[PDB]
Protein backbone atom coordinates (compact mmCIF):
# COMPACT_ATOMS: atom_id res chain seq x y z
CA UNK A 605 0.00 0.00 0.00
CA UNK A 606 1.62 3.24 -1.26
CA UNK A 607 1.66 5.97 -3.97
CA UNK A 608 1.73 4.49 -7.51
CA UNK A 609 3.59 7.61 -8.77
CA UNK A 610 6.61 6.66 -6.63
CA UNK A 611 8.98 4.38 -8.58
CA UNK A 612 11.77 2.42 -6.86
CA UNK A 613 15.16 1.90 -8.54
CA UNK A 614 15.41 -1.75 -7.44
CA UNK A 615 12.48 -2.74 -9.75
CA UNK A 616 13.63 -0.76 -12.81
CA UNK A 617 15.76 -2.74 -15.25
CA UNK A 618 16.99 -0.94 -18.38
CA UNK A 619 16.26 -2.51 -21.78
CA UNK A 620 17.86 0.12 -24.06
CA UNK A 621 18.40 3.80 -24.81
CA UNK A 622 15.58 5.41 -26.81
CA UNK A 623 16.88 8.87 -27.65
CA UNK A 624 18.04 12.27 -26.52
CA UNK A 625 15.12 14.28 -25.16
CA UNK A 626 15.70 17.98 -24.71
CA UNK A 627 17.57 18.39 -21.40
CA UNK A 628 17.65 14.63 -20.89
CA UNK A 629 18.39 11.23 -22.39
CA UNK A 630 15.34 8.97 -22.53
CA UNK A 631 15.63 5.20 -22.01
CA UNK A 632 13.35 2.18 -21.85
CA UNK A 633 12.89 0.26 -18.58
CA UNK A 634 11.00 -2.74 -17.29
CA UNK A 635 9.21 -1.92 -14.03
CA UNK A 636 8.38 -5.12 -12.14
CA UNK A 637 7.60 -3.87 -8.60
CA UNK A 638 5.71 -7.09 -7.65
CA UNK A 639 8.30 -9.42 -9.29
CA UNK A 640 5.55 -11.12 -11.34
CA UNK A 641 7.92 -11.80 -14.27
CA UNK A 642 6.43 -9.27 -16.72
CA UNK A 643 5.94 -5.85 -15.09
CA UNK A 644 5.45 -2.98 -17.54
CA UNK A 645 7.51 -1.12 -20.11
CA UNK A 646 8.00 2.58 -19.34
CA UNK A 647 10.07 5.44 -20.74
CA UNK A 648 12.42 7.19 -18.35
CA UNK A 649 14.04 10.57 -18.86
CA UNK A 650 17.02 11.61 -16.75
CA UNK A 651 16.95 15.23 -15.58
CA UNK A 652 19.63 17.17 -13.63
CA UNK A 653 16.21 26.57 -12.26
CA UNK A 654 13.40 24.98 -14.33
CA UNK A 655 15.05 21.57 -14.78
CA UNK A 656 12.04 19.83 -13.15
CA UNK A 657 9.50 21.95 -15.02
CA UNK A 658 8.82 19.10 -17.46
CA UNK A 659 7.60 16.90 -14.60
CA UNK A 660 5.67 19.77 -13.00
CA UNK A 661 3.85 20.46 -16.25
CA UNK A 662 3.30 16.94 -17.58
CA UNK A 663 1.86 15.64 -14.30
CA UNK A 664 -0.97 18.22 -14.50
CA UNK A 665 -2.11 17.02 -17.94
CA UNK A 666 -4.53 14.21 -18.82
CA UNK A 667 -5.32 13.74 -22.52
CA UNK A 668 -5.17 10.85 -25.03
CA UNK A 669 -2.86 12.78 -27.39
CA UNK A 670 -0.37 13.97 -24.76
CA UNK A 671 2.14 11.47 -23.43
CA UNK A 672 1.00 10.30 -19.99
CA UNK A 673 2.85 11.03 -16.74
CA UNK A 674 3.24 7.87 -14.65
CA UNK A 675 5.53 8.89 -11.79
CA UNK A 676 9.01 9.65 -10.52
CA UNK A 677 12.18 8.06 -9.18
CA UNK A 678 14.86 9.80 -7.08
CA UNK A 679 16.91 6.99 -5.51
CA UNK A 680 20.66 15.85 -7.29
CA UNK A 681 18.92 14.11 -10.17
CA UNK A 682 15.47 12.86 -11.10
CA UNK A 683 13.87 10.31 -13.39
CA UNK A 684 10.58 11.20 -15.04
CA UNK A 685 8.60 8.04 -15.72
CA UNK A 686 6.25 8.16 -18.72
CA UNK A 687 4.27 5.67 -20.75
CA UNK A 688 6.29 3.85 -23.42
CA UNK A 689 5.11 4.96 -26.86
CA UNK A 690 6.43 1.92 -28.77
CA UNK A 691 6.60 3.10 -32.42
CA UNK A 692 8.78 6.12 -31.62
CA UNK A 693 8.71 9.46 -33.43
CA UNK A 694 7.30 10.45 -36.81
CA UNK A 695 10.71 11.72 -37.91
CA UNK A 696 12.12 8.19 -37.65
CA UNK A 697 8.84 6.47 -38.57
CA UNK A 698 7.69 8.30 -41.73
CA UNK A 699 10.90 7.85 -43.80
CA UNK A 700 10.85 4.06 -43.24
CA UNK A 701 7.10 3.39 -43.84
CA UNK A 702 4.60 4.00 -46.64
CA UNK A 703 1.85 6.43 -45.50
CA UNK A 704 -1.06 7.96 -47.45
CA UNK A 705 -2.19 11.60 -47.39
CA UNK A 706 -5.36 11.09 -45.25
CA UNK A 707 -3.40 9.23 -42.56
CA UNK A 708 -1.04 12.22 -42.44
CA UNK A 709 -4.00 14.61 -42.17
CA UNK A 710 -5.29 12.52 -39.27
CA UNK A 711 -1.95 12.75 -37.40
CA UNK A 712 -2.08 16.52 -37.92
CA UNK A 713 -5.63 16.64 -36.53
CA UNK A 714 -4.62 14.71 -33.42
CA UNK A 715 -1.73 17.04 -32.74
CA UNK A 716 -4.18 19.98 -32.81
CA UNK A 717 -6.53 18.18 -30.42
CA UNK A 718 -3.70 17.69 -27.91
CA UNK A 719 -2.40 21.24 -28.36
CA UNK A 720 -5.84 22.82 -27.95
CA UNK A 721 -6.09 21.05 -24.61
CA UNK A 722 -2.53 22.05 -23.67
CA UNK A 723 -3.22 25.72 -24.35
CA UNK A 724 -6.52 25.49 -22.42
CA UNK A 725 -4.39 24.44 -19.42
CA UNK A 726 -2.26 27.60 -20.00
CA UNK A 727 0.93 25.92 -21.25
CA UNK A 728 3.03 26.36 -24.38
CA UNK A 729 5.06 23.46 -25.82
CA UNK A 730 7.92 25.40 -27.56
CA UNK A 731 9.16 22.22 -29.24
CA UNK A 732 6.42 20.99 -31.58
CA UNK A 733 8.27 18.99 -34.23
CA UNK A 734 7.73 15.58 -35.91
CA UNK A 735 10.72 14.42 -33.87
CA UNK A 736 8.75 15.04 -30.62
CA UNK A 737 5.41 13.51 -31.74
CA UNK A 738 5.12 9.78 -31.03
CA UNK A 739 2.95 6.91 -32.29
CA UNK A 740 1.37 4.20 -30.11
CA UNK A 741 0.18 0.76 -31.36
CA UNK A 742 -3.02 2.13 -32.99
CA UNK A 743 -0.97 4.81 -34.76
CA UNK A 744 -2.22 7.46 -32.35
CA UNK A 745 -0.31 10.65 -31.80
CA UNK A 746 1.02 11.18 -28.32
CA UNK A 747 2.81 14.53 -28.10
CA UNK A 748 6.11 14.24 -26.23
CA UNK A 749 9.29 15.98 -25.07
CA UNK A 750 8.05 18.79 -22.80
CA UNK A 751 11.65 19.83 -22.17
CA UNK A 752 11.01 23.40 -23.28
CA UNK A 753 7.38 23.71 -22.17
CA UNK A 754 6.30 26.69 -20.06
CA UNK A 755 3.36 27.97 -18.10
CA UNK A 756 2.06 31.15 -19.68
CA UNK A 757 1.30 33.36 -16.67
CA UNK A 758 -2.44 34.06 -16.43
CA UNK A 759 -3.61 37.23 -18.15
CA UNK A 760 -0.62 37.02 -20.53
CA UNK A 761 -0.38 35.98 -24.20
CA UNK A 762 3.34 35.08 -24.38
CA UNK A 763 6.34 33.95 -22.34
CA UNK A 764 9.86 35.41 -22.72
CA UNK A 765 12.90 33.06 -22.58
CA UNK A 766 16.35 33.46 -24.12
CA UNK A 767 17.58 29.86 -24.25
CA UNK A 768 21.33 29.80 -23.42
CA UNK A 769 21.77 26.52 -25.34
CA UNK A 770 20.18 24.88 -28.39
CA UNK A 771 16.53 25.34 -29.49
CA UNK A 772 14.63 24.32 -32.66
CA UNK A 773 14.92 27.74 -34.38
CA UNK A 774 13.82 26.32 -37.77
CA UNK A 775 10.44 25.58 -36.12
CA UNK A 776 10.18 29.00 -34.48
CA UNK A 777 8.10 32.04 -35.42
CA UNK A 778 9.81 35.38 -36.10
CA UNK A 779 8.67 36.83 -32.75
CA UNK A 780 10.48 33.88 -31.13
CA UNK A 781 13.65 34.36 -33.18
CA UNK A 782 13.62 38.14 -32.83
CA UNK A 783 12.15 39.03 -29.43
CA UNK A 784 12.44 35.67 -27.67
CA UNK A 785 8.68 35.95 -27.04
CA UNK A 786 6.70 32.72 -27.23
CA UNK A 787 2.98 33.11 -27.73
CA UNK A 788 0.35 30.41 -27.90
CA UNK A 789 0.26 31.38 -31.59
CA UNK A 790 3.95 30.50 -31.80
CA UNK A 791 3.07 26.81 -31.22
CA UNK A 792 0.65 27.11 -34.13
CA UNK A 793 3.56 28.28 -36.32
CA UNK A 794 5.51 25.18 -35.17
CA UNK A 795 2.52 22.99 -35.94
CA UNK A 796 2.55 24.48 -39.45
CA UNK A 797 6.19 23.38 -39.82
CA UNK A 798 5.26 20.01 -38.28
CA UNK A 799 2.62 19.54 -41.02
CA UNK A 800 5.18 20.44 -43.71
CA UNK A 801 7.32 17.66 -42.21
CA UNK A 802 4.40 15.22 -42.26
CA UNK A 803 3.81 15.80 -45.97
CA UNK A 804 7.52 15.51 -46.84
CA UNK A 805 7.39 12.20 -44.87
CA UNK A 806 10.34 13.76 -42.99
CA UNK A 807 12.76 13.34 -45.91
CA UNK A 808 15.96 14.73 -44.41
CA UNK A 809 16.93 16.31 -47.75
CA UNK A 810 13.68 18.35 -47.71
CA UNK A 811 13.78 19.07 -43.95
CA UNK A 812 13.01 22.60 -42.75
CA UNK A 813 16.63 23.42 -41.85
CA UNK A 814 17.93 22.04 -45.15
CA UNK A 815 15.35 24.06 -47.06
CA UNK A 816 15.66 27.29 -45.08
CA UNK A 817 19.48 27.33 -45.50
CA UNK A 818 19.15 26.93 -49.28
CA UNK A 819 16.68 29.80 -49.40
CA UNK A 820 18.86 32.03 -47.21
CA UNK A 821 21.67 31.24 -49.66
CA UNK A 822 24.38 31.90 -47.06
CA UNK A 823 26.34 29.19 -45.24
CA UNK A 824 25.37 28.29 -41.67
CA UNK A 825 26.92 30.48 -38.99
CA UNK A 826 26.44 33.31 -36.48
CA UNK A 827 24.24 35.43 -38.79
CA UNK A 828 21.77 32.60 -39.70
CA UNK A 829 19.05 33.43 -37.15
CA UNK A 830 19.17 37.03 -38.37
CA UNK A 831 18.94 35.97 -42.02
CA UNK A 832 16.19 33.43 -41.29
CA UNK A 833 14.28 36.20 -39.52
CA UNK A 834 14.72 38.62 -42.44
CA UNK A 835 13.74 35.84 -44.86
CA UNK A 836 10.56 34.95 -42.99
CA UNK A 837 9.85 38.68 -42.59
CA UNK A 838 10.02 39.01 -46.39
CA UNK A 839 7.25 36.41 -46.48
CA UNK A 840 9.17 33.47 -47.91
CA UNK A 841 8.18 30.09 -46.60
CA UNK A 842 8.89 26.39 -46.96
CA UNK A 843 7.82 25.23 -50.44
CA UNK A 844 4.61 23.31 -51.06
CA UNK A 845 5.70 19.69 -50.67
CA UNK A 846 5.36 17.38 -53.67
CA UNK A 847 1.79 16.12 -54.15
CA UNK A 848 0.60 18.28 -51.25
CA UNK A 849 -2.81 19.76 -52.14
CA UNK A 850 -3.08 23.56 -52.50
CA UNK A 851 -5.78 23.77 -49.79
CA UNK A 852 -3.46 22.03 -47.33
CA UNK A 853 -0.57 24.39 -48.17
CA UNK A 854 -2.90 27.33 -47.51
CA UNK A 855 -3.46 25.89 -44.05
CA UNK A 856 0.26 25.73 -43.45
CA UNK A 857 0.59 29.29 -44.79
CA UNK A 858 -2.10 30.55 -42.41
CA UNK A 859 -0.28 28.92 -39.51
CA UNK A 860 2.76 30.72 -40.92
CA UNK A 861 1.22 34.19 -40.78
CA UNK A 862 4.13 36.51 -39.87
CA UNK A 863 2.09 38.52 -37.34
CA UNK A 864 1.06 36.14 -34.54
CA UNK A 865 -2.42 37.61 -34.02
CA UNK A 866 -3.53 36.49 -37.52
CA UNK A 867 -2.82 32.76 -37.06
CA UNK A 868 -5.54 30.20 -36.43
CA UNK A 869 -5.98 28.93 -32.87
CA UNK A 870 -5.64 25.20 -32.24
CA UNK A 871 -9.35 25.26 -31.43
CA UNK A 872 -10.14 26.67 -34.89
CA UNK A 873 -7.84 24.17 -36.62
CA UNK A 874 -9.70 21.06 -35.41
CA UNK A 875 -12.92 21.27 -37.49
CA UNK A 876 -10.91 22.42 -40.52
CA UNK A 877 -8.58 19.40 -40.44
CA UNK A 878 -11.43 16.92 -40.06
CA UNK A 879 -13.14 18.40 -43.12
CA UNK A 880 -9.93 18.35 -45.18
CA UNK A 881 -9.06 14.80 -44.01
CA UNK A 882 -12.54 13.73 -45.17
CA UNK A 883 -12.02 15.23 -48.61
CA UNK A 884 -8.92 13.03 -49.25
CA UNK A 885 -9.90 9.77 -47.46
Ligand SMILES: CC(C)[C@H](C)n1cc(-c2cc(C(C)(C)O)n(C)n2)c2[nH]nc(N)c2c1=O
Nearest residue numbers: 622623630647687688689690691692736748
Ligand atom coordinates in the same frame (compact mmCIF):
# COMPACT_ATOMS: atom_id res chain seq x y z
C1 LIG B 1 10.03 11.94 -28.07
C2 LIG B 1 11.49 11.47 -28.18
C3 LIG B 1 12.36 12.73 -28.31
C4 LIG B 1 11.91 10.58 -26.99
C5 LIG B 1 13.41 10.23 -27.07
N1 LIG B 1 11.11 9.34 -26.94
C6 LIG B 1 11.39 8.32 -27.82
C7 LIG B 1 10.68 7.15 -27.83
C8 LIG B 1 10.99 6.03 -28.75
C9 LIG B 1 12.13 5.90 -29.55
C10 LIG B 1 12.03 4.73 -30.23
C11 LIG B 1 13.07 4.24 -31.22
C12 LIG B 1 12.44 4.19 -32.61
C13 LIG B 1 13.63 2.87 -30.84
O1 LIG B 1 14.15 5.18 -31.20
N2 LIG B 1 10.86 4.13 -29.86
C14 LIG B 1 10.31 2.86 -30.33
N3 LIG B 1 10.23 4.96 -28.93
C15 LIG B 1 9.59 6.99 -26.88
N4 LIG B 1 8.71 5.99 -26.62
N5 LIG B 1 7.88 6.38 -25.56
C16 LIG B 1 8.22 7.57 -25.16
N6 LIG B 1 7.62 8.28 -24.13
C17 LIG B 1 9.33 8.03 -25.98
C18 LIG B 1 10.11 9.20 -26.03
O2 LIG B 1 9.85 10.08 -25.23
